[PDB]
Paper text:
Contactins (CNTNs) are neural cell adhesion molecules that encode axon-target specificity during the patterning of the vertebrate visual and olfactory systems. Because CNTNs are tethered to the plasma membrane by a glycosylphosphatidylinositol anchor, they lack an intracellular region to communicate across the membrane. Instead, they form coreceptor complexes with distinct transmembrane proteins to transmit signals inside the cell. Finally, structural analyses of five CNTN–amyloid pairs indicate that these proteins interact through a conserved interface involving the second fibronectin type III repeat of CNTNs and the copper-binding domain of amyloid proteins.
In addition, complexes formed by chicken CNTN3(FN1–FN3) and APP(E1) also proved recalcitrant to crystallization. To resolve this issue, we designed a fusion protein of CNTN3 and APP, speculating that it might yield suitable crystals. We thus fused chicken CNTN3 to APP by inserting a GGGSGGGS linker between the C terminus of the FN2 repeat of CNTN3 and the N terminus of the E1 domain of chicken APP. This chimeric protein crystallized readily, and we refined the structure of the CNTN3–APP fusion to 2.75 Å (Rwork/Rfree = 0.197/0.231). Overall, the binding sites identified in the structures of the CNTN5–APP complex and the CNTN3–APP fusion protein are similar to the one identified in CNTN4–APP structure. Residue H137 in APP contacts Y681 in CNTN3 (Y853 in CNTN5), and its side chain forms a hydrogen bond with the carboxylate group of E686 (D858 in CNTN5). H137 also packs against V652 in CNTN3, as is observed at the CNTN4–APP interface. At the CNTN3–APP interface, residue T651 forms a hydrogen bond with S124. This contact is identical to the T751–S124 hydrogen bond observed in the CNTN4–APP complex.
Residue numbers in the entry:
A (entry chain A): 496 to 699, 1030 to 1190
B (entry chain B): 496 to 699, 1030 to 1102, 1108 to 1190
The structure:
């Protein structure tokens, strides 16, 4: 008769690639067990599959082995099947479900393409990497694009693994202009490769508010690019970040405002007015305007000139302010003896609250 | 306006996955061409599709590029499209039809499985590989199976690409026994990969005739597995391969006999009668039934399976036994077992499958 099912299949010493499996000989049927075979089942493999062991062949005197060539960051089950001179026997009950350790991703997106859209846009699309190839939590993409002939890259960090496209809207885009495009990958453990550079064609003044207490709030008229006073005569400076969100939606009623964030650079604004447009003087005031973020959050596009590097960081256990992530980006470039050239927020966790930062470091003169 | 169609499209340096394309600029319609795109059409692609180049960026002053990631042994047509500030231009006239060079097949059969059958049988199935993925002429399969837990493979060569099935029939098969199965691919350019190993459970006396001149012909009774005399009691030994075929059919009126082949080893048969009703060692003739099924060969450790198909050769069983035996001797090994491939006539074949093992 064939051997009975082995018992107590346990997993120890689990890594990103390997696993140590141990078991106990089941009820053999009057013929000594001559070989052991290991099988594994994951949410991605269709049923039970054979796995490669070291040593390659397991005999009856052996009760532990190393399974190799596994996929990092995958939930695994294991079972053992014993063999006789008669033949293969009943498989063992599965082991406890275990997840291999994380690793840097190795597969860049396939089918990097794009095109279309409305005027002054660049639509970049790609195939989303499935879960079985992300190799760890915090999987994201890095989209890079630049016009033909130029050296400086334009890059942005896309933190959602399911996002299949990025749209770049800026008046620097020419009608049906060719761009070199490449999409990379990363996770918590580090950065992965980029896809090959391919060609994507283009298609064929930002909402801000500025405040100075004692004066009527100012806002950016998106049509003429000029700073304008409060449409009403009463709205002075605002205390809370939620109130800044309300004022953004009040001044831009035809926009879907979902968040706010401080601008990275101050601006000098003359012609502030008091309540009721009384005592309008010409005294300038340097303030930091709040950007009224529209619709679903999209990371900023950063310029990465030659010899500069693009860095980014995100911490799911931290919900911090714009000033916090600026200090993070500024200090990080200092540790490498470089200057901070451009940065943006990642992963909003609240009104003007974020869990990460993207930034560019550059050398000095 | 958009650019005009490029001219002077030429395709050179054709490999199995590579082709060098070059072209000439048309009229830019007073707006300079800023990019070029290469497109291809095949019997399998849905119309014209963009193809990858190296580099995959082609500016307006480049007039040659290297197309990559092509499918080996496929007819390709190429065309070039220019672009400018207005948009994509008129596509060029397509180039001449060219076929990529052959290469080993890369895609093993998916959906390998099996199960069922009669007693002492192991049924193995898989999804056949379409012509698009065969990468050359002479595409075929290698079916390997072994009892679960063992290491030594039993392999057979399947020459027809459209064949999705192989039944292994042997007394050593136990009822409803687990087996490890994998199916591989190959073509005239070489061997391809094997599929993932899958478990296939088995299910819940070969027809042949032997002759000895001066005595009545004998034949194997499939029910009891014993050699029996000529039922008619008149037929003596036969001198033609075609006449042996008719006697196989006469002995088995209920089976579709399509070919005959010499058995690889002799047998010992007793109870020889004369016309009208002492052992003798003779080489029996196998009565092949139905479509041709290649023999199952054992491939022990350190031994290699080799198969050869000559579409310009139609030879006999002895000729392929010699080819197999000389092929191993050239490899400093011995011929262990063999079987015929590709019938081209009555007891005539176009190839052989065999195993070479070390002298030890």
């Amino acid at each position: 008769g064939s051997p009975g099912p082995p018992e107590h299949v346990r997993v120890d010493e689990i890594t990103d690639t390997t696993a140590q499996i141990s078991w106990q000989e089941g009820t053999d049927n009057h013929s000594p067990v001559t070989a052991y075979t290991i099988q594994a089942r994951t949410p991605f493999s269709v049923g039970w599959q054979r796995v490669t062991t070291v040593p390659d062949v397991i005999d009856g005197n052996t009760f532990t082995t190393t399974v190799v060539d596994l996929n990092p960051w995958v939930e695994y089950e294991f079972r053992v099947v014993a063999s006789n001179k008669i033949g293969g026997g009943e498989p063992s009950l599965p082991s406890e479900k275990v997840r291999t350790e994380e690793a840097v991703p190795e597969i860049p997106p396939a089918e990097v393409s794009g095109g279309g859209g409305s005027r002054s846009e660049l639509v970049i699309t790609w195939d989303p990497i499935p879960e079985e190839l992300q190799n760890g939590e915090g999987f994201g993409y890095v989209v890079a694009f630049r016009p033909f002939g130029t050296t400086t890259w334009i890059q942005t960090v896309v933190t959602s693994p399911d996002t299949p496209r990025y749209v770049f809207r800026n008046e620097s885009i020419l009608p049906f202009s060719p761009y070199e495009v490449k999409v990379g990958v990363y996770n918590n453990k580090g950065e992965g490769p980029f896809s090959s550079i391919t060609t994507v064609f283009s298609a064929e003044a930002e909402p801000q508010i500025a405040m100075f207490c004692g004066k009527l709030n100012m806002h950016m008229n998106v049509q003429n690019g000029k700073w304008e006073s409060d449409p009403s005569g009463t709205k002075t400076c605002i205390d809370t970040k939620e109130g800044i969100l309300q004022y953004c939606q009040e001044v831009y009623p035809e926009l879907q405002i979902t968040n706010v964030v401080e601008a990275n650079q101050p601006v000098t604004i003359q012609n502030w007015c008091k309540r009721g447009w009384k005592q309008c003087n010409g005294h300038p005031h340097i303030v930091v305007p709040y950007r009224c973020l529209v619709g679903e959050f999209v990371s900023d596009a950063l310029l990465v000139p030659d010899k500069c590097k693009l860095l980014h960081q995100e911490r799911m256990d931290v919900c911090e302010t714009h000033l916090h992530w600026h200090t993070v980006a500024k200090e990080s470039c200092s540790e490498k003896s470089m200057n901070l050239h451009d940065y943006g927020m990642l992963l909003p966790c609240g009104i003007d609250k974020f869990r990460g930062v993207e930034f560019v470091c550059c050398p000095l003169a």
